[PDB]
Structure formats: C-alpha cells, structure tokens
Design a binder for this molecule. Structure first.
Ligand SMILES: [Mg+2]
Ligand SMILES: [Mg+2]
Ligand SMILES: [Mg+2]
Ligand SMILES: [Mg+2]
Ligand SMILES: [Mg+2]
Ligand SMILES: [Mg+2]
Ligand SMILES: [Mg+2]
Ligand SMILES: [Mg+2]
Ligand SMILES: [Mg+2]
Ligand SMILES: [Mg+2]
Ligand SMILES: [Mg+2]
Ligand SMILES: [Mg+2]
Ligand SMILES: [Mg+2]
Ligand SMILES: [Mg+2]
Ligand SMILES: [Mg+2]
Ligand SMILES: [Mg+2]
Ligand SMILES: [Mg+2]
Ligand SMILES: [Mg+2]
Ligand SMILES: [Mg+2]
Ligand SMILES: [Mg+2]
Ligand SMILES: [Mg+2]
Ligand SMILES: [Mg+2]
Ligand SMILES: [Mg+2]
Ligand SMILES: [Mg+2]
Ligand SMILES: [Zn+2]
Lengths: 152, 108, 48, 45
RNA sequence: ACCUCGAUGUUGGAUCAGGACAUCCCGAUGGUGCAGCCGCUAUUAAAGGUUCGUUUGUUCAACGAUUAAAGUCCUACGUGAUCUGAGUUCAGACCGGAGUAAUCCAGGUCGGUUUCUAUCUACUUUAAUUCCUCCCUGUACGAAAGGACAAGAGAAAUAAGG
RNA sequence: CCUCCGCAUAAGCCUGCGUCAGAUACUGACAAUUAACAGCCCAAUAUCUACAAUCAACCAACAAGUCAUUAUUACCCUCACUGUCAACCCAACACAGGCAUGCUCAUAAGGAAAGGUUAAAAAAAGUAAAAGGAACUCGGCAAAUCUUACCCC
RNA sequence: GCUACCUAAGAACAGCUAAAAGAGCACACCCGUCUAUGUAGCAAAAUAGUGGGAAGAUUUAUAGGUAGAGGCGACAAACCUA
C-alpha cells in the first residue's frame, strides 16, 4: 500500500536516492540540458525548481548558500546558480524546467526524458507544437468564437 | 514441486498465443512534419532530437575548449554565434561560443 | 558578505582532480609534520 | 571445504611422479613400460 | 496382513481449520426425590461460542485464576512440497544392569543436516452472539438459611465490516 | 559511494583485456620480460668449535638453545647460464570458498552495492514502536541489555 | 601436494591488564558454539551475525617420512586426494 507516497524508491536507499538526484541536478545546472531515465528526471524536476527558488533568495541568505553547497557537488556552479540562473528567472515565478520524453534507451530500452532549464543557450528542443490556427477545425472554432463575441 | 506430466503443444500454443501474450499494435505512431520520419505522438522525434543532440555536442565541445579546464563554469550568460554573425547589444557581456558553420535553419 | 565555498575538487571522488587533491592532503600532512623523523617516515612509508 | 586437495608444487610433483623415481624401482619401470605400450605421449610426470 | 518398502515422512505444538451430534454454554420443552437458588434427567436445536497460566516434550493429568461454558469425536490419531523437532531404539558419550567380549537394554541423561523454483486439480472479497450492572427485590418462594423469574433501563466483551 | 583492501616477494600458472586486422576477457598476426634483484657455489687432508636468545646490561631462569676456525699443501690467468610479462594459482566456472611472508593500518593504492520501471502478496536483512515486560517457547532460541545466586559433570 | 602423526630447518603472534604464567581482555591468525539464510547453494559444507582460543599441548609456509593383511590416531572405529 503506497497511498499518498510521493517519492520514488531509487538507488540503494534514501541517501542513495538523494545522491543520485544530486548528481543529476548538478549535471542539469552545469549543462542546462540533461537526458536521463524518465522517472529520475521526474523526481529531480522538483529539486531543480527548488534550487532555482533558493538562488532567487540570494547569495547573502546563509540558508540558500548552504542548500546550494549541499546540492551542487561542483562548487563552481554555486556562483552560476546565484548569478546566471536566478537572475534569468527573476521575472518568472515557476516552470523553470522543461521535461520531454525521448525515444527509449538503446541499451536497456529504458524510458528516458530530457530536462532543460528554459532560456538556455543550447539549441532548442523539437518541442511539440499544437495544430495551426488555420486548420479546418481551428477555423471552425474561430468562427464559433467570433459568433459568440458578436452576440455579446 | 516438479511437473506431473508434460504439457502438450496444443496447451502450450494456447498459452503462448493467447492475445495477452501477443504484441499490441501501437496506433500512436505519426509522421514528423519537420523531417518526415516516424515518431510516437507523446515522444520526441528521434531524428530531430539526434540533430539537436549533435549540435549540442558540438557547442558543448566548443564550450569546453573555451573553458580550458574543470570547475571553470562562467558566471555570465552564454550565446552561440555562427559564421557571418556578430554579437548583438543583448549578446554584449555574454560568453560567445563560436561555431564554424552556418546557423541551422531550425536553430534561431 | 557572500561566502562562496572554495572551488576545489572533491576529496573522495573517483577522478584525476580528486586524486590530486588527496595527494595534496598527503603533502599537507607532511608539511604539518614537525620532526624531520616524522617527515621522512611519512614520505617513505609507502613502498612501491 | 573440500575439492582443493591439489596444492601444486613442482618439487613434490617431480619427486613423486618423476622419471627418476619411476625408474628407481622395478614397479615404476613397469609403469613406464605400460605407458609406452599404451602409447602415452607422457610416460612420466 | 488386503494397497503402499524403484519411500503413503508417523508423537506433541504453531497456523488454518471442514464436518458429526452421541450438546459443555447460549435457545425452546417434559419429568423430578422441581418450595426458591442451585441442580439431575430426557426431547429438540450444530447459527454462534467453547480462556489464560506453573511444572512436564506431553497429548492428557494436577494445580492457580477465570468463564455462560472452558464439550466428545472424525478429518492419513486433519494439516512437516505451510512451520517447529522438545520427546521419540542412527552415527558420539556417561550411569545402573546383561555378557568373557563385541555389543546390548521398548531404563535414564547430554548432543545430534526438516530439501523442493508449483506442471495439473482445487481455491484466492459468499440481518452476530454473549456476559454483566441497576430495577423488578430482599419481592415471588421459604421456618430459617437463603433467594428467583419475566418486563424495563444501561453498560460492556468478543466476532464481522469499515 | 566503498575500501574487506592494496603494492611486492614466495609458491603456483605459462602469454591468459599490449598493438594491428577480422570478427562476433574471442580469432590471426605482430611485439615483449635486457641484472646489479634471485637462483646456479666452495680443492684437499687433518685439526678446532663448554659459556644461548630475549635492546644483553642488571635480573630471572628452563623447555638448555640458528649463527666461530686453525696447520700444511694446492691455486688466478679469463663477469657465463637461467627467472624477470599478465587482469594470474587450488576449487569442473570471471566460483561470496582456500591461499605463506614484508610493508601500507586506511590508504598516495584498489574498487562500484542500483540493466530501467513499479513499490502487490509471500520470503530475506535491517531500523522504530503506545502499555506490558518472558505472559512466547522444550528451553529467554532470536533480539535487546550487561545482568545475581545455587546445582550436576 | 588433502588429512593423521612425525623429521629437518623457518616464519607469525597489534594493543591493554598483569608479570618469567599451557595467565585475563582483545586484533591479526586458528577454530567452528548458537541462530538465520542457503539446500542443483557463492559453496559436492558457504555466507551474515554470534562465539572459543589467540606466548602456546599455538598457528603456519617449505621439503622429507610412515601405504592398505597396512599406516597414523590426546579411540571419534577419527584421518589416509570430496
Ligand atoms: Mg531499485
Ligand atoms: Mg598444504
Ligand atoms: Mg499384504
Ligand atoms: Mg492370506
Ligand atoms: Mg514411485
Ligand atoms: Mg440431539
Ligand atoms: Mg487410530
Ligand atoms: Mg529431538
Ligand atoms: Mg556401563
Ligand atoms: Mg535428547
Ligand atoms: Mg550444542
Ligand atoms: Mg520445510
Ligand atoms: Mg511456494
Ligand atoms: Mg552493479
Ligand atoms: Mg532490478
Ligand atoms: Mg514496545
Ligand atoms: Mg512460560
Ligand atoms: Mg525475569
Ligand atoms: Mg504457553
Ligand atoms: Mg542468545
Ligand atoms: Mg600479544
Ligand atoms: Mg593465554
Ligand atoms: Mg569409543
Ligand atoms: Mg562406536
Ligand atoms: Zn523529426
């Protein structure tokens, strides 16, 4: 029975789970785009958002500095976290990460996903785009909208 | 426990050809409008993703060459500039990664 | 006012930089050793 | 616990089943003769 | 001595229990050497229940405290491809005894390997009982001793389901 | 993140993750380990050799102990041979076992428990547990604590 | 070349308490008390925990010796290539 359990059981235990997520998140902070098993990316997305929030908190915040020191195993990324990512997202309030499924791993056919920080310098992902507004159905719905607006 | 009798090929065929065993046809496959290769609707296109990954690998190799060593991550934003392209006012004050090729059409 | 942690390699990781940092830890113990006897002992104890 | 009863050592090997020891006694000479008659490629050890 | 010795694993316990009624308790009923309270006996009733401990391998027995009661059995003395091996005539050993000795004793005692990944069958979500408290009541009954029913009210305990 | 380790010698094995090319830690070819380390010794005939070791000094010993030459005769005039690799041996196996010694006594050296997901039962290992504290059980087995006294042999 | 015993000449035994000890706690090392797992297993006797000894009647590397009407044995009819 796992009603309400929100954390996956990963690695060799709770500590190993935290360390795996920490390594994935350090890689994400360094490269701004990381491909990894789908479940691990899903688990680490929340921690990535939380680091962005802690970076928003600021350098002077000792709690934020301690959190960054723990979570970024490569200490050169803490200045990055506090001076490149948080300033980038200062305007935003959330949704700093884009996660998209990827064709299964060639080795073990594992469900993989790519997670990136939005606005990175890397080439854009082939994002799935909704159907154009000029399609038949979309044009009919536009006619509906125009008729309703004219009525009101 | 050991089998009491050999199970016949008829029973075995029943078991291993029960539709629960058979592979299910997938109806979520579709053509990628960009390159025309097949892709699952929810999954990203393999061909396009490989294009992006190879371009990312080139850019990252240039990034590593410019960094010159471990633990040298910049404290400023980064911009990738291709041949025949000059930094803009926004690009000013950002680390320039120069790629020795024309900017990909998909890349913007 | 911002106390960034030092940008050094991990002392326990499996990497070239980590190995160099462990070598630095060894050499720091050698430096901290006061007596020349202790210095020589630390410098020559590992037989390779 | 068992199985590793063979603790190899060339000194013991040659002193127990060598050509010299086999020829030392008439019985070992007959052992070598039997091996030769059978056509063994290895008369002694 | 009829199946099984090209193996049907066999005491007691744990676990889960299916069934019988020749009913231990709860229900109804006849008789009584049934005044009442306890009882005894017989008919009907197997829906439900039928305790925890000390020594002992004990099943049982005795004892302690309870209970409404702590039922008799069958089920390979149910159930070891679910479990335990304390007893129990494998290998070691001691005591008493037998024998010249080897060795033995339905004598004691200390120790002593519990296999199996399930092919088939079968199966895997099918209106509750009881005790006690008060009151009736110190009433009916009875010389006293003692001492009820029924009705009513309240509390619980267990079982099932959440 | 782990580190029982690890590096050498011995013993064992005998080219057994060096390069190239083919396949699909395999096959074929090419290469390699260079002695100072170690092994491989000693001209005779007699003749000597009571007094441990233990920091050898006090002491204490008992179980009474690895460590020595002289005399004469011969004799120099001319640095060979062999081991040197490896991820390795004995266990039918890339076997959780066996495996001597010197250093390292936690490491400078050596390694990776997780193929991916889910987080059903049963099973194994571990941790925590209201009140109680052996009522379990053959037996305090196990676990937790660190705990008295009496018997048999 | 295992094992029983022996022969030659070797090696090992941290630390603490005590003091010249078949002394105590305790590593390495040797063993294998009890539990669990395993039972075609990692293993034709192992693993984890726990435990006995651990300066001695100790453990152990090398070479040699005793051979089946036998050897060897602190007798368990032990061990003598599963
Ligand atoms: Mg897992
Ligand atoms: Mg041996
Ligand atoms: Mg018969
Ligand atoms: Mg007859
Ligand atoms: Mg049969
Ligand atoms: Mg009846
Ligand atoms: Mg019977
Ligand atoms: Mg028994
Ligand atoms: Mg006797
Ligand atoms: Mg017994
Ligand atoms: Mg015992
Ligand atoms: Mg069993
Ligand atoms: Mg089963
Ligand atoms: Mg692994
Ligand atoms: Mg798995
Ligand atoms: Mg408790
Ligand atoms: Mg008891
Ligand atoms: Mg007690
Ligand atoms: Mg009991
Ligand atoms: Mg115990
Ligand atoms: Mg000592
Ligand atoms: Mg002692
Ligand atoms: Mg005897
Ligand atoms: Mg006997
Ligand atoms: Zn595409």
């Amino acid at each position: 029975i796992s009603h309400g359990r929100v954390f996956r059981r990963m690695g060799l235990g709770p500590e190993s789970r935290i360390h795996l997520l920490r390594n994935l998140l350090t890689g994400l902070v360094r490269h701004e785009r990381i491909e990894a098993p789908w479940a691990r990316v899903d688990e680490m997305r929340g921690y990535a958002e939380k680091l962005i929030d802690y970076g928003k908190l600021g350098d002077t915040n000792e709690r934020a500095m301690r959190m960054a020191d723990f979570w970024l195993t490569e200490k050169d990324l803490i200045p990055k976290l506090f001076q490149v990512l948080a300033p980038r997202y200062k305007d935003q309030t959330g949704g700093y990460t884009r996660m998209l499924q990827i064709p299964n791993r060639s080795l073990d056919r594992a469900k993989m996903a790519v997670i990136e920080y939005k606005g990175n310098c890397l080439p854009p992902l082939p994002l799935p785009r909704r159907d154009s507004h000029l399609t038949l159905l979309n044009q009919l719905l536009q006619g509906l909208r125009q008729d309703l607006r004219q009525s009101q | 426990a050991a089998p009491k009798n050999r199970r016949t090929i008829e029973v075995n065929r029943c078991r291993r050809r029960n539709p629960q065993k058979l592979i299910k046809v997938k109806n979520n496959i579709d053509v990628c409008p960009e390159c025309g290769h097949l892709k699952q609707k929810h999954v990203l296109c393999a061909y396009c993703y490989e294009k992006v990954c190879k371009e990312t690998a080139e850019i990252r190799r240039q990034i590593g060459k410019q960094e010159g060593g471990p633990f040298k991550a910049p404290t400023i934003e980064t911009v990738v500039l291709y041949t025949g392209e000059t930094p803009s006012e926004q690009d000013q004050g950002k680390r320039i990664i120069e790629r020795d090729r024309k900017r990909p059409s998909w890349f913007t | 006012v911002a106390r960034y942690p030092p940008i050094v390699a991990s002392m326990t990781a499996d990497s070239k930089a980590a190995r160099l940092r462990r070598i630095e830890r060894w050499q720091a113990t050698v430096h901290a050793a006061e007596s020349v006897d202790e210095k020589l002992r630390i410098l020559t104890k590992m037989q390779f | 616990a068992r199985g590793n009863e063979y603790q190899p050592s060339n000194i013991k090997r040659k002193n127990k089943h060598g050509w010299v020891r086999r020829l030392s006694t008439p019985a070992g000479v007959q052992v070598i003769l039997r091996r030769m008659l059978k056509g063994r490629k290895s008369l002694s050890h």
